[PDB]
Amino acid sequence: KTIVSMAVIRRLPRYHRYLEELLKNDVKRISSRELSEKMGVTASQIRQDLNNFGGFGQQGYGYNVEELYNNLTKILGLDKTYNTIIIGAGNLGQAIANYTSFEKSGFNLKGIFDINPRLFGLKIRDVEVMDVETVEDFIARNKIDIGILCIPKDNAQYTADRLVRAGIKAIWNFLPIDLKVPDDVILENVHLSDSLFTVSYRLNEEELFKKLK
Amino acid sequence: KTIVSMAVIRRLPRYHRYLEELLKNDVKRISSRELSEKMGVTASQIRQDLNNFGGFGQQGYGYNVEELYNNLTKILGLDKTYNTIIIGAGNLGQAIANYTSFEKSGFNLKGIFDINPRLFGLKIRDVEVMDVETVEDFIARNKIDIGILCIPKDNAQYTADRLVRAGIKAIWNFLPIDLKVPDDVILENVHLSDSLFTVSYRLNEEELFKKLK
Numbered sequence: 204k205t206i207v208s209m210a211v212i213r214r215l216p217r218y219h220r221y222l223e224e225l226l227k228n229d230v231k232r233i234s235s236r237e238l239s240e241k242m243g244v245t246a247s248q249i250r251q252d253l254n255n256f257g258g259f260g261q262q263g264y265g266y267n268v269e270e271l272y273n274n275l276t277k278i279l280g281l282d283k284t285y286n287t288i289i290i291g292a293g294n295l296g297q298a299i300a301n302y303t304s305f306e307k308s309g310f311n312l313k314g315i316f317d318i319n320p321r322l323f324g325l326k327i328r329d330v331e332v333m334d335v336e337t338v339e340d341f342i343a344r345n346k347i348d349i350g351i352l353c354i355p356k357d358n359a360q361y362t363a364d365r366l367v368r369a370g371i372k373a374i375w376n377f378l379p380i381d382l383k384v385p386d387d388v389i390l391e392n393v394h395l396s397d398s399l400f401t402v403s404y405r406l407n408e409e410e411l412f413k414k415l416k
Numbered sequence: 417k418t419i420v421s422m423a424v425i426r427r428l429p430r431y432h433r434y435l436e437e438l439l440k441n442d443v444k445r446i447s448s449r450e451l452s453e454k455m456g457v458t459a460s461q462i463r464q465d466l467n468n469f470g471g472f473g474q475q476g477y478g479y480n481v482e483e484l485y486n487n488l489t490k491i492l493g494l495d496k497t498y499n500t501i502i503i504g505a506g507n508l509g510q511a512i513a514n515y516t517s518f519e520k521s522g523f524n525l526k527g528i529f530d531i532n533p534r535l536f537g538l539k540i541r542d543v544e545v546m547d548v549e550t551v552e553d554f555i556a557r558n559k560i561d562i563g564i565l566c567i568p569k570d571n572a573q574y575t576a577d578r579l580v581r582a583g584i585k586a587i588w589n590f591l592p593i594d595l596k597v598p599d600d601v602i603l604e605n606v607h608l609s610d611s612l613f614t615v616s617y618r619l620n621e622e623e624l625f626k627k628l629k
């Protein structure tokens with residue numbers, strides 16, 4: 204559970220993303236209305252989302268872009284440091300280990316784990332592939348906060364259970380399975396199909412709307 | 417644009433997933449309330465969303481699970497077949513080639529393309545990695561609907577332009593660039609940081625609110 208609702212929380216990185224860019228194109232000032240146009244969120248809902256955390260900008264003036272960007276940076280906790288690990292050193296785990304932008308936002312990859320002894324010692328950027336049998340000692344020893352799961356679904360639950368009982372604080376999960384974790388552990392499920400299926404929806408919408416409406 | 421708003425569109429695959437799980441568990445009916453409890457969305461948004469597409473469920477019994485699942489499938493265009501290709505056969509493009517559930521949802525991978533000659537001829541499932549030099553030709557012969565971009569940023573735009581010239585209808589883009597496409601081409605940008613940053617948000621929330629309250 205959360206102080207702010209998950210619906211709000213999920214818009215926040217989107218605001219952050221859009222502001223960053225505005226910042227990159229030296230746009231200085233943004234209105235809720237401008238944000239609303241781009242974001243597909245009502246201007247009143249944007250004010251409401253932001254009002255949870257305070258009063259950047261004011262009275263008919265929009266927001267200072269740099270200030271709102273930076274406040275969002277703090278609100279998302281990106282001024283902190285998170286020790287991460289990846290489980291699964293196959294294509295997906297290596298692809299994720301290669302999301303190097305995350306290091307700048309405070310996610311420090313500490314280790315990658317696999318079951319395949321052929322992969323032990325493999326160096327992926329800065330880190331070694333180690334035997335997942337050591338992962339629980341490793342978690343406690345390196346104060347790991349987030350376990351990223353990039354393995355086949357088959358034994359994912361037992362893997363989540365080991366990360367949990369070793370003190371993991373959160374699991375970033377790529378698998379198509381709803382894992383059970385205790386209520387105090389953050390579990391975030393990536394479902395890429397939720398993005399792809401909007402592509403099929405859109406390719407089809409004109410045609411659907413002969414049929415339906 | 418889109419007839420329905422994108423905020424509704426993007427909730428639809430999530431409904432589809434949960435109904436799917438219900439359906440495999442042989443749960444026959446589910447009320448808006450039991451459904452929202454399960455998903456942590458409002459029971460009234462659920463109804464508002466579906467209302468864009470018709471009178472499902474009713475007064476006192478909730479939604480029939482198969483019926484709603486089936487309607488969501490057809491709404492998201494998943495009663496049809498889409499021919500895809502992937503550009504980039506490095507770790508990311510090969511991970512996405514191994515998202516094999518998409519095939520059952522109707523996305524048929526026809527080809528994978530790269531610039532690296534050391535990869536030409538590699539077999540991934542039933543397809544071969546080909547020189548992306550041939551991609552424009554391949555797209556016309558094979559009626560490709562969707563291009564999936566899994567290449568480095570620096571020359572995404574050039575590559576996107578090629579897929580657009582060859583008649584591609586939609587690009588599912590994994591790069592954090594904002595690609596320019598014509599207005600009739602579906603562009604969908606995956607941003608994994610939009611998910612990861614909700615993890616740092618939730619980990620840091622308690623401290624965030626101490627500093628604020």
Ligand SMILES: NC(=O)c1ccc[n+]([C@H]2O[C@H](COP(=O)([O-])OP(=O)(O)OC[C@H]3O[C@@H](n4cnc5c(N)ncnc54)[C@H](O)[C@@H]3O)[C@@H](O)[C@H]2O)c1
Pocket residue numbers: 290291292293294295296316317318319335353354355356358362377378379396510511514515516517518
């Ligand atoms: N919709 C979908 O089809 C969908 C959804 C999510 C993920 N995926 C895919 O993404 C995941 C990984 O794919 P990939 O391409 O990287 O596969 P890959 O390239 O075969 O890598 C899998 C790796 O995981 C290692 N491994 C297997 N079991 C364990 C374990 N119990 N503990 C630690 N390591 C293990 C294995 O040694 C191999 O290195 C799988 O879930 C796969 O199905 C697909």
Ligand SMILES: NC(=O)c1ccc[n+]([C@H]2O[C@H](COP(=O)([O-])OP(=O)(O)OC[C@H]3O[C@@H](n4cnc5c(N)ncnc54)[C@H](O)[C@@H]3O)[C@@H](O)[C@H]2O)c1
Pocket residue numbers: 297298301302303304305503504505506507508509529530531532548566567568569571575590591592
């Ligand atoms: N936040 C982030 O850090 C972030 C966001 C998105 C993607 N990514 C990462 O994901 C993308 C791909 O990752 P990866 O692990 O697969 O890298 P990789 O394993 O080096 O694979 C990239 C592949 O693309 C091939 N390639 C390069 N240019 C072309 C081209 N024009 N056409 C066809 N093939 C080409 C290249 O030969 C290589 O096989 C990159 O954008 C990388 O930056 C990171």
